[PDB]
Write a protein that binds this ligand. Structure first.
Ligand SMILES: OC[C@H]1O[C@H](O[C@H]2[C@@H](O)[C@H](O)[C@@H](CO)O[C@H]2O)[C@@H](O)[C@@H](O)[C@@H]1O
Ligand SMILES: OC[C@H]1CNC[C@@H](O[C@H]2O[C@H](CO)[C@@H](O)[C@H](O)[C@H]2O)[C@@H]1O
Length: 349
């Protein structure tokens, strides 16, 4: 078929499965959330928490689906249909090494639901406690062993792919042991080889040698807020792609529709980026496409805490809070606008 409605399998959308309901999970997990203290504020801070009631959830926006459980099969089915609408072929699943049965259950449900709609799943490996190259290898082995035969498990030209959040917290001399073909615990030329995509944060002076010396296969930028880092400043993307191509690396810029996290980080107003009826999203996605990259990542499907979500949101005013919403656009606008940009991306690919 050549209808311009097909999934794009070089488009990765960052997905969070940490939401709960009292009924399914025992608590409205993540809808309730601690308010972060000000890193530059007083020493006697009692910031408190967001209770995660119907009236007061840990987001500046409000989900169309309500305080949903990420364990709810019917929520998962709706999410996969939303992925189909957005034409986002790859769900990049947050992964925190929780080693508990409820997470294992969610991962299986997600894979199954994804496959029903021909969506693929890869893992976004987060900075879990004591993360290091040895337990990363062990966890990569576990994930590939457990899920590698699942039909929804993502592969690019035969290789799995992982995004590694805050990869800079691990020294290149450690990374090399895992990622150099010569490394003492290398995954290269093994059953566990994978495209490893590290987080490009700061200036080329620092990041270029880091990426080369760590032997990452590529890099992404994550942050939805333009200018938050050098990597998340879209005017740098042409130059970043040039370097990537010169050095055999895969550049996967992250684009987002906006940013606001002030419910959970009330001191962090400087990072707010307004959606302005979709123009912000358009500007950022346009920059990614114009940079001539082979793959794009979307921050995010449902990071509701950070207000970067493309998942449908609805207008809501409670006695506790007046939520932001999609303004002059319909709840599914960011899904359909994503499909539009996926089309433009494919057009120039
Ligand atoms: O200050 C809150 C800040 O937290 C996150 O970013 C973290 C870290 O993960 C990241 O590597 C660096 C990049 O400079 O910033 C840290 O403080 C993230 O949630 C961000 O959006 C937020 O503003
Ligand atoms: O997925 C990468 C990145 C995206 N932003 C959130 C990061 O996690 C951190 O912040 C959230 C709230 O936004 C907290 O709930 C987490 O505990 C914290 O680690 C995440 O790593």
């Amino acid at each position: 078929n050549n209808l311009g409605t097909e999934l794009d399998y070089d488009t990765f959308c960052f997905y969070y499965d940490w939401y709960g309901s009292e009924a399914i999970d025992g608590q409205y997990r993540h809808w309730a959330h601690a308010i972060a203290p000000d890193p530059n504020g007083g020493s006697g801070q009692n910031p408190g928490t967001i209770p995660g009631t119907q009236e007061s959830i840990a987001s500046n926006f409000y989900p169309q689906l309500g305080r949903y459980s990420s364990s709810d099969p019917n929520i998962l089915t709706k999410h996969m249909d939303m992925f189909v609408m957005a034409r986002t072929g790859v769900l990049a699943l947050t992964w925190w090494n929780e080693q508990d049965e409820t997470e294992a259950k969610r991962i299986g449900l997600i894979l199954d639901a994804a496959d029903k709609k021909k969506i693929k799943v890869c893992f976004h490996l987060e900075p879990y406690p004591s993360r290091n190259v040895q337990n990363l290898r062990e966890n990569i082995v576990k994930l590939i062993t457990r899920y590698g035969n699942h039909p929804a498990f993502y592969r690019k030209d035969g290789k799995p792919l992982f995004f590694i959040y805050d990869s800079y917290l691990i020294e290149p001399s450690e990374w090399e042991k895992l990622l150099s073909p010569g490394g003492s615990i290398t995954i290269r030329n093994t059953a566990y080889d994978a495209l490893m995509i590290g987080l490009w944060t700061s200036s080329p002076t620092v990041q270029r040698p880091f990426i080369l010396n760590a032997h990452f296969d590529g890099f992404y930028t994550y942050f939805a807020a333009t200018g938050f880092t050098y990597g998340s400043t879209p005017t740098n993307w042409v130059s970043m792609q040039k370097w990537a191509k010169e050095n055999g690396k895969i550049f996967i810029p992250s684009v987002g529709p906006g940013y606001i996290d002030t419910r959970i980080r009330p001191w962090n107003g400087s990072v707010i980026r307004t959606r302005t009826d979709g123009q912000y999203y358009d500007a950022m996605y346009r920059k990614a496409i114009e940079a001539g990259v082979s793959a794009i990542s979307i921050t995010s499907f449902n990071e509701w805490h950070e207000g970067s979500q493309i998942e449908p949101a609805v207008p809501y005013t409670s006695s506790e809070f007046t939520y932001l919403d999609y303004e002059n656009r319909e709840p599914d606008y960011y899904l359909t606008r994503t499909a539009y940009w996926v089309g433009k991306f494919r057009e120039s690919k």
